[PDB]
Amino acid sequence: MDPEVTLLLQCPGGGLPQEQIQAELSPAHDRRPLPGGDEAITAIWETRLKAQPWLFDAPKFRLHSATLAPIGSRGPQLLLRLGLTSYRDFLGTNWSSSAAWLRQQGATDWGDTQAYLADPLGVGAALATADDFLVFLRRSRQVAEAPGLVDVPGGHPEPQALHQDLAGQLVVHELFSSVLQEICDEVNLPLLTLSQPLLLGIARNETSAGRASAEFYVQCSLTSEQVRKHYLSGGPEAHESTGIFFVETQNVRRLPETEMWAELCPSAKGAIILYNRVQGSP
């Protein structure tokens, strides 16, 4: 099995487009204040700044829950319940040495293992080329998280916009746009060579206390050879990764049985499992 990844949601229909997804952004969906107070988060942050004074905080979307409509129905097919969190809150909760204690306290107090966790929502992509390969990236050995492991394109999108209901559609547009922007920024591809994303589902990273990522399918009009040229033509300062490579979609089907599987970070494992279940499997 793979204990570091769990599926929260698998989408129907081969994946959902933007127009079929509703978001509810509400302070009811935020992390709950820690039992001893949020001063523990402030302590971790001030300690970190006194070692690396150039770090900066950033806002993030928080995933509270998601609910699928009955399969085959008319109208919107998914509701995402979102709150707001931050990089600082993430470092103080999901990335804390005591994250597992916070999950137990959450179960006890709120019947929710995630109630005291920041749980910022990540995004990632199963990115397919015109000659039927998926795109993979090799992570730097010097970063804090999953050093030297294999990833897919992705990031962690950031809130900003100037009625609580209609604020929803703008959030859904920002999530889908962010997936494409991350592909442009890291893979160095033109925006116009990319299809609109489809949402495949949501996966949780159990090595980061259950933090979730939305996993998408994106098609590119360029061949693998052309994508490699674009990636490399940026130079070492144009990408965080140190290398790119490609696997035939034919072979992705049995990836969990290869030696590559042990090298894949948890969010990339989630993207591949969801691609195989939702775009593969005829």
UniProtKB/Swiss-Prot annotation:
Cofactor: Mg(2+)
Effect of residue 156 to A: Abolishes enzyme activity with UDP-galactose
Gene Ontology cellular component terms for the protein in this record: nucleoplasm
Family: Belongs to the Nudix hydrolase family.
Enzyme class, broadest EC rank: hydrolase
Binding site for substrate: 56, 87, 139, 144, 151, 156, 158, 267
Disulfide bond positions: none
InterPro entries given in the database record: NUDIX_hydrolase_dom, NUDT22/NUDT9-like
The keyword Iron is annotated on this UniProt entry: no
EC number: 3.6.1.45
Catalytic activity: UDP-sugar + H2O = UMP + alpha-D-aldose 1-phosphate
Residues annotated to bind Mg(2+): 182, 186
UniProt entry tagged with the keyword Cell cycle: no
Alphabetized PROSITE patterns for the sequence: NUDIX
Molecular function GO terms recorded: GDP-mannose hydrolase activity; metal ion binding; UDP-sugar diphosphatase activity
Protein name, as recorded: Uridine diphosphate glucose pyrophosphatase NUDT22
Region (Disordered): 148-162
Effect of residue 182 to A: Abolishes enzyme activity with UDP-galactose
Motif (Nudix box): 168-189
Alphabetically ordered keywords of this record: Hydrolase, Magnesium, Metal-binding
Domain Nudix hydrolase: 118-278
Function, in words: Hydrolyzes UDP-glucose to glucose 1-phosphate and UMP and UDP-galactose to galactose 1-phosphate and UMP. Preferred substrate is UDP-glucose.
